[PDB]
């Protein structure tokens, strides 16, 4: 029964995962629970003003994807794949891209 | 030390390539003048000098009431401003140092500068695909490639000058991102994309090639986390940046031209998550969830991908881009797009004429990219194979093909040279192998020299003639010049009321607006086909009926271009059939039928055998007024037309609602004043 | 002023010199030991 | 499919596309023209002269065939550089690929000299 | 007419709740700042970054783009210098 | 009359203050309009007057701002930037 497979999922995940990654997996959940609720609003009240909806939504999707990219560049299991990238360079890049994102959404929110 | 000599030889080669790229485009300035060519560049020039004078915020808000009277045009809402912003920035930088260059010169010489920078961008872009020895070849090839020069000669101030620089810079940044897997390079690729989106309408090509590359990397099973980070970052950033441009608006989200990228984004997420669950669960515990989850989320996507189209909520393909997917559409559905002979499909002759050696070397660069596949080389394979098709659909797009043709020809020739030059490593059948290698190296040197002489000949003879001026050679070989276009526009500029409205066919609208500074009815950017049809109906209709339209639109003057005294084949008489078609295309025009102007035999001719409606339309009467008595040639009777090679049929007539205001020295341009309403209420019959 | 013939000659000579120099570069590359160690 | 099996399809596509089949389909010219003899008969003409922007159906296949021989010649040579191949074959490959590379180029340049009287003149 | 203001204010207050759930997770999972230090670069970095994020409200309310970039160049330069120094220090400490 | 090609508005000018005048709201449509007066009456002189007047679309600064229907979308970005900041605080110093 699927509840049993989910139990065998969480029994692993909670044991296997460094704390700095659980932190990210909670931040991603906050992002996703904000974006899903913006969407459920948009399709309840209506598309106007499409500018502000599309800005706040793409701001959520962008912050989610930048968080997943941090969640992947920093993971030691991928050091063989992102050669030459230290965790600190990945964090500087994450703040660079998040700065561009929060500038352009501020262009588009209005 | 060896490193010094390698660096010296790289620097020397690249600086010669840059100097050649800049210098080969000057032929047009040396032959005539530092002046802007063609029709379309004049709108870019006027808008650039506007931005250089009024400042950004007044250019962006700018609304122009001198064009498309009485509708006007929203300029900043309907333009790609990147070229103008670039020119204004360079202008202000030079003026800051008090290098007070005239803005016209900055515009004229802007294209050579960026067509020099593209040689360095092409060097690095090829170096990252192969080695520096291939990048030097690709630079030297793209320096002179005539297909690119054809759109980039000095004074050819049009977007295609900047677009290929932004395009190659975007491909360099994307290749760096995919090779490296770094968010920094993804954000720099997003900024390069945003720059390109601001500067040319062809950005849809990149936002449709990159998703296809990612898809091909998935199907091959090469997809790995570097591609996920690159794609999802380039997608979110380039989307929210491209949506900034007011002419782009919501199209990146609400148009089927961009849904390929969103589909690949969603499928990247599904694949990145299945790759994780398959890594956590055991097979017997994975398979049930795998098949169930796919049988739900695939069904969701399969439904939404239908609903989006069936509702029409996602806009369908625009007729232009669809005419790129189906060559037959525009010739049946939009005669404006049909009328521009630049949209004809490409024959083998133009491929040889514009590329020569590259046509022979491109399959070898492809053979190398297929021999040594890699996650970055699949990009160049896809770019090549896509441009090879789209260039065949429409000659104008050869510009997009020339860069990849040069990169692949450079890879191929590099692989040949570096193959055979290894057999010449004597210095630290063997004599046969050495003479074979020497002969093949000589053959390659010979080919590369012939490519230089071909490209220089083509650049000199074909693509360097202007079009605001006409040229001929007298029997002594002196250049005869006809300036009649500028003479007529200057006469308009000085000797007519400053509020007068000049009616003209839509080709000349940018010229009248730039040189004459008078209001016009219709213009090259045919954003209102109804208005163009309303002008064609007035040109094609009879002189009694056309007056009601000219008085309806409050016209002051009408201008026609007549070649029959000089053999200028591009006159308004040849355009007449297109003016008839467009005038009859609107429902208000159904009395205008093309079959009425042909003779019963089914031919168009203006001599005595011509249709009695053709001989009485407004345009024929404007072109051939008084002309019937001109001794056009010594062996020909009076009224011989140099272009139809026919003696006109209706020689003597009076104009009743127009008076001849000015006919230029060679009659090349004729302008009439539409007579004011008769003072006594008499009818004009 | 320089004519378009003098420019055409100058550009032909730059082109030939460029391609001959690249065909030298390929030799200076392949003779390198460090490129193949 | 394997990489070679895709490359073969791309080469075969290059043949047709470079021969301008997309021009033939929609403009649909004949394979050759004909022109009056001084005695009034018709001689066929293979090339639409002076029209750089125009083509007959077979002219494009002829030109693209020369282009394909030129492209494949270097592939034959690079194949020819292998050390396993008995030398009596090797000197052939250096023959066939070399004469492909030269003769196809020269014939294409002559065909373009035929299309444009005044080309490089 | 618009949609009713009572639902606008409803959703505008509902969207704050995920920011409470974030803290309700972090506090109860084990989050910490005990590795923080008062080294000058570490304070200057967070000051610069906080001001960089605050500038976006002033841009949204008052400034234009050219003014915003004329401030953000300076504030990003100083934040980048302090971030680079602080991250180098952290990298050494991590790798020791 | 207020005319672009056909008349968009036609109204009587009131006799006020020694002058003929009217106050009215311009149409929803931008273009190069003309005011016209065309007092053609039997036996009186034909009076014609016209003044060309361009009507332009709104400037981008004049669009509506702080629409209260959109407060959720403002609170979204002003939540995301705060979450990002607090995360940048915790991630480095945990």
Residue numbers in the entry:
A (entry chain M): 4 to 113
B (entry chain I): 10 to 437, 449 to 705
C (entry chain K): 1 to 37
D (entry chain J): 28 to 148
E (entry chain P): 535 to 630
F (entry chain N): 356 to 449
What did the study's authors say about this model?
The dynamic ribosome–translocon complex, which resides at the endoplasmic reticulum (ER) membrane, produces a major fraction of the human proteome. It governs the synthesis, translocation, membrane insertion, N-glycosylation, folding and disulfide-bond formation of nascent proteins. Here we use cryo-electron tomography, extensive classification and molecular modelling to capture snapshots of mRNA translation and protein maturation at the ER membrane at molecular resolution. In sum, we visualize ER-bound polysomes with their coordinated downstream machinery.
The near-complete atomic model of the most abundant ER translocon variant comprising the protein-conducting channel SEC61, TRAP and the oligosaccharyltransferase complex A (OSTA) reveals specific interactions of TRAP with other translocon components. Ribosome-centred refinement of the most abundant population, the SEC61–OSTA–TRAP translocon, yielded a 4.2 Å-resolution structure (focused on the LSU) with poorly resolved transmembrane helices (TMHs) (7–10 Å resolution). Recentring on the ER luminal domains resolved those at improved resolution (6–8 Å). The luminal part of SeC61 reveals a short α-helix, which we assigned to the SEC61α plug. Here, we observe the plug in a displaced conformation stabilized by SEC61γ and the oligosaccharyltransferase complex subunit OSTC. An AlphaFold-based model of TRAP could be fitted unambiguously into the SEC61–OSTA–TRAP translocon map, requiring only minor repositioning of single transmembrane helices and removal of low-confidence segments. As previously observed, the cytosolic domain of TRAPγ tethers TRAP to RPL38e and the rRNA expansion segments ES20L and ES26L. Our results reveal the position of the TRAPα transmembrane helix, separated by a 2–3.5 nm lipid density from the major transmembrane part of TRAP, which comprises TRAPγ, TRAPβ and TRAPδ. In addition, we visualize a contact between the previously unresolved C terminus of TRAPγ and the amphipathic SEC61γ N-terminal helix at the cytosolic face of the membrane. Near the luminal end of its transmembrane helix, the FG and BC loops of the TRAPα fibronectin-like domain associate with the SEC61α hinge region, which bridges the pseudo-symmetric N- and C-terminal halves of SEC61.
